[PDB]
Amino acid sequence: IANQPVVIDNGSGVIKAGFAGDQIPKYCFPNYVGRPKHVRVMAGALEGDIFIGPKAEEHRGLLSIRYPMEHGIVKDWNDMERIWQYVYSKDQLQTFSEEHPVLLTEAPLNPRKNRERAAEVFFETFNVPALFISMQAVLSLYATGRTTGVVLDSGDGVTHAVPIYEGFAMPHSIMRIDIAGRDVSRFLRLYLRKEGYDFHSSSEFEIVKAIKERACYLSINPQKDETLETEKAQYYLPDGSTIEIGPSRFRAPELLFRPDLIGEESEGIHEVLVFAIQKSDMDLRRTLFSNIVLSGGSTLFKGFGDRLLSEVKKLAPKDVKIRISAPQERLYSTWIGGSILASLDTFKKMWVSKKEYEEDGARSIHRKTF
Amino acid sequence: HLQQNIEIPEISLPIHPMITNVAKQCYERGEKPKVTDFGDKVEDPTFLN
Amino acid sequence: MADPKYADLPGIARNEPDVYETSDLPSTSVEHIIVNP
């Protein structure tokens, strides 16, 4: 026995949510809380001091933004409860919580303590009847409806590649990199001070993030493309100010393939990705050549998959046809896939009742992990 | 029912008030309720729950 | 209103506008196939 569950597609930057069997996440709001810088002695103005969404984005000025979650590992768990309480807002739910099944998201390569504390929240502070969350890549595959695939997510500062054969991942061939657009914008901030500009405020930095997402693409041959002169079509701020560009429009996003240039013993998404592919079956790579699942919204770049095709030619196999799946609802793919799963009578076997948590809890977490 | 030894009485099935009122009004109109008789209330998971 | 209030003291923007103003002015295509043969 249950109610209609809700799929909460936790984007590393923007969390999303929405009831079962639907097509579009009901809510789409980010992951940070602002608190006012200035206080007042005046009587009659606003209250709250904790805002997320249009309230925060509305009056960004005093609300000092702080991202509580880092690579899934959140440190403001209490504030996450407040965030989920905000998910239970009047404008948000007006529903109950201890009487409905739900669905959140889970990326791999994580400490169990996160799931442990999560169960503590939803089953100590809440009394959720049944709830089970699994690997996000399968949800993307649900959106595809394709047995095998190479899913690559793209969070704000989180990325990971997973190959799955008919609903079976490869634990010995799954990789992850701790970065996405987060340090890309931070690196753009670096470029800003490289040519003398600081955008040290939190909101200011998110504005920089929006600028990045607004004007950035991929180049063909980076060192050869460096030989030209960027004309820097200046954009003009909401404040009304000159915005130069530099190589940032193409150089800054390729930091992903130059972690040594940023200071990290890593190689590249496609590099370690194809390495894990090499660790897979001699035969399944053939399937994965056409089964290339693109996911995550950080992927929005001109010639993104095209430069990725160039990367494929860099890591060329022994002449075998390859194909990439590049949909348009890559962020929504996981939410919709969960909605598909949430629209299944198979969750009876795929769930864990709260009574099970009452009986064991931690042991149910360890044993009934997946 | 006990005096009649019915062993169990036919307990009232709880039906929604607005649903009954809409069905009554539709019967006054001479036709059973339409598809979107509630309009966009179909997309209200609260009412659905 | 404050009309007799205005009759008492003289600090009223008489015959002058109270507002001044700077006037008006006039996709992700899939199938990236690396056909390698």
Ligand SMILES: Nc1ncnc2c1ncn2[C@@H]1O[C@H](COP(=O)(O)OP(=O)(O)O)[C@@H](O)[C@H]1O
């Ligand atoms: N024009 C754009 N170019 C690149 N990335 C973008 C653009 N617009 C939005 N994004 C990205 O969409 C991504 C959504 O990330 P997130 O919701 O954290 O993904 P995930 O669901 O994989 O965690 C953000 O990382 C943000 O940088």
